[PDB]
Structure formats: C-alpha cells, structure tokens
Design a protein around this nucleic acid. Structure first.
Ligand code: ATP
Ligand code: K
Ligand code: K
Ligand code: MG
Ligand code: MG
Ligand code: MG
Ligand code: MG
Ligand code: MG
Length: 153
RNA sequence: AUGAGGUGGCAAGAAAUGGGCUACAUUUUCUACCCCAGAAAACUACGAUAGCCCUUAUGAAACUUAAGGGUCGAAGGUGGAUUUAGC
C-alpha cells in the first residue's frame, strides 16, 4: 500500500498525500460521477473493481483556493490547462468530489465539445426563433444533473 | 485529276472481348486532426468519375470537352474454369 492513502476525504488531503491514491466509494461514483470521468478511466474502474485517484499538486492547489473562497466576492474562474493526457479532467473530478461532499450544488458539463458537433436532431427553438435547440444533448445532461443534485432539487 | 481548295457531315452500339478505374464496406463511412476524438453503420447504410438538370472554364463555335453544384441512390454482398505481377 505504498501507493495508497487511508484518507478518503478530499477535504483532508494535503502535500503529505501527493503521489498517493485515495479511494472513491461506489456510492460516490453513482451519485457524484454519473458522467465526466474519462472513458479509459471508467474501463479501469470496471477492471480493477475500484476507483482510485492519485492526489497531485494541481488538484491540491485548486482545493486550497476553494477552501478559502470568499462567497461574498464574485465567482472566480479557475482554468486547468496542460498538454494532452496530463490529467486535466481527473484533476477537475478530484475538485468536483470535494465540493460534492461539502454539500455544494454541482453544475458539471463533462464535455462541452459534444454540443458543437455530430448533432442529428438540431431543431429550431420556440422561445427564440433565432436559436437552435438540441433535445438529445440537453435531455442527456438533465438526467445526470438530476442524479448528482437529487437531494437539493 | 488518283492533284489543289471551300462548305457541311460521319465517327454509332444488337453483341462479344482485352486493359484499366471505382466498388461491394467495420483494418469500413463522415467530420475534426494528420494518428490518445466524436458520430455513422442495411431499403435515408456502403456503393457511379453513370443518367438527368443547372452553373462555370476554354473556344468564333460545347446536348457534346473539362470542372463544380443539384437531383438521382442502380448493379455490386468479394467473383467458376482459367489467368497476371512481384525476391
Ligand atoms: N489523478 C490521476 N489519478 C489516476 N490516474 C490519472 C490521474 N491523472 C491522470 N491519470 C491517468 O491519465 C489518463 C488521462 O487523464 P485525463 O483524461 O484526466 O487527462 P487530460 O489531460 O484531461 O486528457 P485530454 O487532454 O485528452 O483531455 C487517465 O485516464 C488515467 O489513466
Ligand atoms: K477488367
Ligand atoms: K475480379
Ligand atoms: Mg480531459
Ligand atoms: Mg482528290
Ligand atoms: Mg447513401
Ligand atoms: Mg454525378
Ligand atoms: Mg462562353
């Protein structure tokens, strides 16, 4: 267990946990992550029968900013960037897991590129005739949004 | 006039056959990208560089030649005997 950590609460992760994997319970995978996890990481959860996420500095830095958030000031925009496959998505998921366990309302868009390509039913909107609706993309997200924030809706 | 010039015209397809091109698809089709993606995937799929219509390019001259677009969505579902090429 040299690569694992017994601290499964993302609110208690610190620099001493860097490089160590913490476990995400199956209950949180169903509620917090009905979507957003990388497709290949989802294959690993099915194969290893567990979801373990390495604690890294990008997420630790961002967790430090969110724990000191001044909710009176306007919302701050944090942007994760880096080369392909460096762990941008999973760093975001580690932060989503922190706020989910702090009773925040999670508005998670797992992949915004899916809303600008490969749309079969692109209907015209009735609320605004100059805009287009996307019933399949919108209904899919509503189902996952309901699963994550069911206790607040 | 078996020579010279002018005007207009033929150069088609019952059929057979040689070579080639494109396909019959999932190691595929479309898009992004040029290789860590998203979709498509059987009668609105794959599949025409064919047919029909229009535009454009060249030209004095274009149903005719070429390019592009629209429309159209066929045979084909991997091919018998035989046979070609490659160290
Ligand atoms: N924190 C982590 N814990 C465990 N595995 C990780 C972690 N970060 C990255 N990985 C591994 O790297 C892979 C890629 O991670 P991820 O998809 O988050 O990267 P990314 O930079 O967002 O990728 P892309 O550039 O494609 O959007 C994961 O599927 C996993 O195998
Ligand atoms: K042939
Ligand atoms: K053949
Ligand atoms: Mg990512
Ligand atoms: Mg004569
Ligand atoms: Mg078709
Ligand atoms: Mg044509
Ligand atoms: Mg002209």
């Amino acid at each position: 267990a040299i690569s694992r950590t017994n601290e499964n609460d993302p609110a208690k992760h610190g620099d001493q946990h860097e490089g160590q994997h913490y476990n995400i319970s199956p209950q949180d995978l169903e509620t917090v992550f009905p979507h957003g996890l990388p497709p290949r990481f989802v294959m690993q959860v099915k194969t290893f029968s567990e979801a373990c996420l390495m604690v890294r500095k990008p997420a630790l830095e961002l967790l430090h900013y969110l724990k000191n958030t001044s909710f009176a000031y306007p919302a701050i925009r944090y942007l994760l960037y880096g080369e392909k496959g460096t762990g941008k998505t999973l760093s975001l998921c580690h932060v989503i897991h922190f706020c989910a366990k702090q009773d925040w309302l999670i508005l998670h868009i797992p992949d915004a590129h899916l809303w600008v390509k490969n749309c079969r039913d692109l209907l015209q909107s009735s609320y605004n005739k100059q805009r287009f609706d996307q019933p399949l993309e919108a209904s899919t997200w509503l189902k996952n949004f309901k699963t994550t924030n069911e206790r607040f809706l």
